[PDB]
């Protein structure tokens, strides 16, 4: 079988190039700048995914810069990077060699939805909690992902380990420096992005996380639509018409537009009757118009919906140990350093 070698730099650690050999390459998806490959590292047998992005001559690649700085059990790990030619003539491509994870939250959710079954609530708790940890960690550096959606939540279904991936839109937000509004994918965009705001904060990720939670509870996206106006109608049907004060907090250029006049649908009627009330209560504090009224990621981790995860005897339904849930660092806890009394339960200290 064909072995390929390349000179590549480790994603973490010494800025020191190494010979890297890999084999068994195969196409597993497509990217903006070429197909995505699986490969097997010859030295360890470990599976990686290799994706290509365009190298700009003018400035360092932001995704690589961010991914060299991150080290967290719920974020996909950058193993190596190297440059190559690619699909388009004359271009130089950055190749990111990431630890391979075989499934996503989206695949598991569609598997249950197609079967007209609800994802067991223990998995909803595990997946959302790990998502909020990954957000707490990146937000503690000032980094907003800007493209949270179920397809970017890699999943090992047997261990329930979740890893956030795709940092191609991620940015360190700086108050007073504008940001493009056109990030974040259909169905998951916060209303301030639908309105074209350039002055938003990392709370756009919490809105998107709320959309993922609601989708796991409902079995379908909560705010679908192919245009912003169709998405907004679905938002208003649930949250009710935003007030002028709320619109000023999202994008004050929009305060005087004539929005559909709709009373909020009660949150208890949004979801099916047997939906756990704490899940509805959490969703109601994530899907809020006023961006500063949304929970922060660490506050969401400490929400009572996640209390079952903090029980000394909780197990996966397949009998396994839960994955790592309490290895918080100072960095990850820093937005509220005295928090933890909830987050690290007694048996984890």
């Amino acid at each position: 079988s064909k072995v390929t070698t390349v000179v590549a730099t480790p994603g973490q650690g010494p800025d020191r190039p190494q010979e890297v050999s890999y084999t068994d390459t195969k196409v597993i998806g497509n990217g903006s700048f070429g197909v995505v490959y699986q490969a097997k590292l010859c030295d360890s047998g470990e599976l990686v995914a290799i994706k290509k992005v365009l190298q700009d001559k003018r400035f360092k690649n932001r995704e690589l810069q961010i991914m060299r700085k991150l080290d967290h059990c719920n974020i996909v790990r950058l193993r190596y990077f190297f440059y190559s030619s690619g699909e388009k003539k004359d271009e130089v491509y950055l190749n990111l060699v990431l630890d391979y994870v075989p499934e996503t939250v989206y695949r598991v959710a569609r598997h249950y939805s197609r079967a007209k079954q609800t994802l067991p609530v223990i998995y909803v708790k595990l997946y959302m909690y790990q998502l909020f940890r990954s957000l707490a960690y990146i937000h503690s550096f000032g980094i907003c992902h800007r493209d949270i959606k179920p397809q970017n939540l890699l999943l090992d279904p047997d261990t329930a380990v979740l890893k956030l991936c795709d940092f191609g839109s991620a940015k360190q937000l700086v108050r007073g420096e504008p940001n493009v509004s056109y990030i974040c994918s259909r169905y998951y965009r916060a209303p301030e992005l639908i309105f074209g705001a350039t002055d938003y904060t990392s709370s756009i990720d919490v809105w998107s996380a709320g959309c993922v939670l609601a989708e796991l509870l409902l079995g379908q996206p909560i705010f679908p639509g192919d245009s912003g106006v169709d998405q907004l109608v679905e938002i208003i049907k649930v949250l009710g018409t935003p007030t002028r004060e709320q619109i000023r907090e999202m994008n004050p250029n929009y305060t005087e537009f004539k929005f559909p006049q709709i009373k909020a649908h009660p949150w208890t009627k949004v979801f099916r009757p047997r939906t756990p009330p704490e899940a509805i209560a959490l969703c109601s504090r994530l899907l809020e118009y006023t961006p500063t009224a949304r929970l922060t990621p660490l506050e969401a981790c400490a929400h009572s919906f996640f209390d079952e995860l903090r029980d000394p005897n909780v197990k996966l339904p397949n009998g396994r140990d839960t994955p790592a849930l309490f290895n918080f660092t100072t960095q990850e806890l820093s937005s509220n350093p005295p928090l933890a009394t909830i987050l690290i339960p007694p048996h984890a200290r």
Binding site: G29, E103, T104, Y106, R107, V108, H111, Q151, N152, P157
Partner: peptide, 10 residues
């Protein structure tokens, strides 16, 4: 729409 071509759930 899916990240990967293959899935154990496909």
């Amino acid at each position: 729409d899916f990240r990967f071509f293959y899935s154990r759930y496909s």
